[PDB]
C-alpha cells in the first residue's frame, strides 16, 4: 500500500528549518569523471537535497580546493565521505565515512543508506501535483516548492487503480523490467515463473512485449506481479526496483537481500529469500492469484512494519538521523584514513 | 530544421473532410499471444489513426469472425496482408499483400513502408501541445485535437535550441540511446568513435550514466551527435532512430540503410556507408563538430531531399498510395497465398 509508505517517509523529513539564512556553508569534492547530467543527478538524488535545507553547498570539479565533502572514487590527505549504489564494500584505509547498504556500524564511521532513500525522495517529486494520487504533508519539505500537471497524462492507469477507478484482479500476471545481463538468479527466474503463466520483459533481456517501454510505472500497474531481483545478492541490497513496484500498486516478487523483512513487511510483498526451494518461490504465488480474497491483503498490506499503532523505516531512516552522522563528521577531524607519507 | 520534416509529413497527412458521416466499415484480424498493452499497437501504429477518421473499424481477437485484411506477425485460406517491422524478407507464399521496406515490385502486391512513417507519426503527435518547440500548421489531421500542456516542462533543453536560446558547441560529444549486444556495427565504431573521446550512453549496451534514461527526447540535446546506426545492415531497412536524432536538434552518426540517402538528405546526416571504412568517418566529424560552419548548414538541412525546390518521399509514400493500396485489395477476389491441402 503506498499511501502509507509516501506519508511514512514524509513523516520521516521532519525537520526544523534554520534560525537565518546565514546558512553554515561547506565545501563538496567528487569523483574526477562525473559530470554535468550526472553532476544534475548529484544535486537530484535525495542527498544534495537535505544538505539543501541545513547547510550551504558550491561544488567543485577542482582537486585545487581543500573540502570538507569529498566523494567519489578516482585527495590522499583530506575529509572524505563514502557514497554509493552499486554493492561495493566500505574501507576506511582510503576514505573516513561511509554511505552504504550493510547492515553494518562503526560507530560515527559508517552511515547506511540504501539508495531506495532517493526514489522514496524522488517519487514525493511527481506527487508534487495537482493530478496525483498519493498525498503530501500541508506546507512540507516537499509541498513548499511549486506544483505541477505533468502525472495525468503520464499514469493513467497507474492513476486510476490505486485510487479505485479500476480493479486489480482484472489485470495480467508478471512483467520483467530487467536489463542487465550478469544476474544469473533475475534471468532464470523467468524460466520457471513462464512456465506456469506468461512473463512480460521490458528490458534487452527476456523481453516479452515487442516494445521497449519509456514508463516503468505505467508498465506494472497494468500488471498483478511485479519481479524484483537485483543484480547481485546483497544483505541491505533493496534498491529503488522494490519502490517502483510498490509505487504501481502490484506486488513485488523479490529476491537479493537475504535480510529484506527488515526493511519492509514481508507480508506486502513476495520474499524469495523464505522459502526452502525455488519451487516454492512459485508456490506461494499460485495461491495468490486463485484465491483473491488472500490477494487482497499482500495487496492491501502495509510495505513498512508497525510498532504498537504506529507505522516506521528500519534503523530509524530519517533526514535527521543522517545529521548526527554528518555533523559528527564535519566535526571531528582525525585523519583516520592512511596519512599518505610515501617513502 | 526540423520544420521542415514537419511540414512535409503533414500536409502527406492531408486528406479532405467525411463528405458523410458513414465511415465505411472494415473487419480486420490479428495475432494471439499479446494482450491489452499489445494489441493497442495495432491501434497506435500508422495504421488505424489514418482509417479511423476513413474507414470504421473492428479488430478481431476472435478467430471464428469474417475478415478481409489480416495482419500480425504470429485463417489461412483467405485474404491476407504481410506486415512487417523486423528484418525478415518477402513471403509471398504464406500471405497474400506485402507491406514492408523492401524496393520490390508485384504490381499491388507490394508497398514499401519504412518504419518512420511511424516516429514521425508520433513525433508530430507527441509535440502537439502549447509548450512544444514544433508549431503544426493550423487545423490539420492533428490539429484538430485538443492542444496539451506537458512539453517544456519535460523537455526543458529541447524546447530551448529549437525557440533558439542555446549554444550548440556547447552539448557533448555523442550520445548513443541503444540497448542491444549483439550488433558489434553498434558495439565497435562506438569504441572507435568512443575511444577516442566520449560517447554517452541510455540503454545497457555501451552505457555512461549508470542509468537507463526514461526520457530520450532530452538526452540527445544535452549532447551533438546521436548515434543512429543499425543492428544490423538492409536496404530499403529504415527505421524510427533516425528520426529521434533528427527530432532533437542532434546529428546522426547513421549506418544501416545503404539507400537512406533516397529516403533522406545525405548532406543532413553522417552516413558511413558513404565511406571506404570507419576510419574515414572521424575525419569528416572532427570537421563538423570543430568547424561550426558545416555543423550549421546540416543543422539548417531538412531531413528529406528536395525536388527543384519541393521536399518528397521515397516512392511517393503518402496517405493516398497507402489509402489506394489496400482499395485494389478490396478489389481482386484472387487467392495468391499457397493454397494448403493436405491429402
Ligand atoms: C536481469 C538484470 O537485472 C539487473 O539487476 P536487477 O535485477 O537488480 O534490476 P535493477 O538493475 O536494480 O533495475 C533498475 C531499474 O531502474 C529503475 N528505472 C528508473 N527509470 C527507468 C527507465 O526509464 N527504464 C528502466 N528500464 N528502468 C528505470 C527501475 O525501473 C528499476 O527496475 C541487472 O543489473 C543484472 O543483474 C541483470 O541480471
Ligand atoms: C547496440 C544495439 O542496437 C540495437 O539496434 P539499433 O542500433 O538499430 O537501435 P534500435 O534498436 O533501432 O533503437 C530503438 C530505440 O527505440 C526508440 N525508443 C522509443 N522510446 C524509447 C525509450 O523509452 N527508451 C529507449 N532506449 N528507446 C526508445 C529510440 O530511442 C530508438 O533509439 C539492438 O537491436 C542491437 O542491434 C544492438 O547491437
Redesign the pocket.
Given at each position: 500500500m503506498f499511501q502509507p509508505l509516501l506519508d511514512a517517509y514524509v513523516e520521516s523529513a521532519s525537520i526544523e528549518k534554520m534560525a537565518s539564512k546565514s546558512p553554515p556553508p561547506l565545501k563538496i569534492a567528487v569523483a574526477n569523471w562525473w559530470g554535468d547530467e550526472e553532476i544534475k543527478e548529484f544535486k537530484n538524488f535525495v542527498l544534495y537535497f537535505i544538505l539543501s535545507q541545513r547547510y550551504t553547498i558550491t561544488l567543485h570539479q577542482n582537486p585545487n580546493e581543500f573540502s570538507d565533502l569529498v566523494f567519489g572514487n578516482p585527495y590522499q590527505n583530506a575529509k572524505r565521505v563514502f557514497y554509493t549504489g552499486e554493492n561495493e564494500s566500505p574501507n576506511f584505509n582510503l576514505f573516513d565515512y561511509a554511505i552504504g547498504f550493510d547492515e553494518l556500524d562503526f560507530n560515527d564511521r559508517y552511515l547506511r543508506m540504501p539508495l531506495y532513500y532517493n526514489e522514496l525522495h524522488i517519487k514525493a517529486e511527481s506527487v508534487n501535483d495537482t493530478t496525483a494520487p498519493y498525498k503530501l504533508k500541508d506546507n512540507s519539505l516537499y509541498a513548499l516548492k511549486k506544483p505541477s500537471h505533468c502525472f495525468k497524462e503520464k499514469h493513467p492507469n497507474l492513476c486510476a487503480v490505486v485510487n479505485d477507478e479500476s480493479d486489480p484482479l482484472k489485470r495480467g500476471f508478471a512483467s520483467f523490467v530487467a536489463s542487465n545481463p550478469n544476474a544469473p538468479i533475475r534471468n532464470a527466474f523467468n524460466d520457471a515463473l513462464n512456465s506456469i503463466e506468461p512473463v512480460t520483459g521490458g528490458g534487452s533481456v527476456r523481453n516479452t512485449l515487442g516494445?521497449?517501454?519509456?514508463?516503468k510505472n505505467e508498465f506494472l500497474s497494468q500488471y498483478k506481479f511485479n519481479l524484483c531481483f537485483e543484480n547481485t545478492q546483497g544483505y541491505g541490497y533493496v534498491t529503488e526496483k522494490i519502490i517502483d513496484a510498490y509505487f504501481s500498486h502490484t506486488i513485488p516478487i523479490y529476491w537479493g537481500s537475504p535480510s529484506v523483512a527488515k526493511d519492509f513487511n514481508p507480508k506486502s510483498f513476495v520474499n524469495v529469500h523464505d522459502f526452502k526451494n525455488f519451487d516454492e518461490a512459485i508456490d506461494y504465488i499460485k495461491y495468490l492469484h486463485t484465491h483473491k480474497n488472500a490477494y487482497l491483503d499482500m495487496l492491501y498490506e502495509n510495505p513498512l512494519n508497525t510498532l504498537d499503532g504506529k507505522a516506521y523505516f528500519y534503523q530509524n531512516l530519517s533526514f535527521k538521523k543522517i545529521l548526527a552522522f554528518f555533523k559528527t563528521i564535519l566535526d571531528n577531524d582525525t585523519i583516520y584514513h592512511d596519512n599518505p607519507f610515501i617513502f
Open positions: 516494445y521497449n517501454v519509456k514508463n
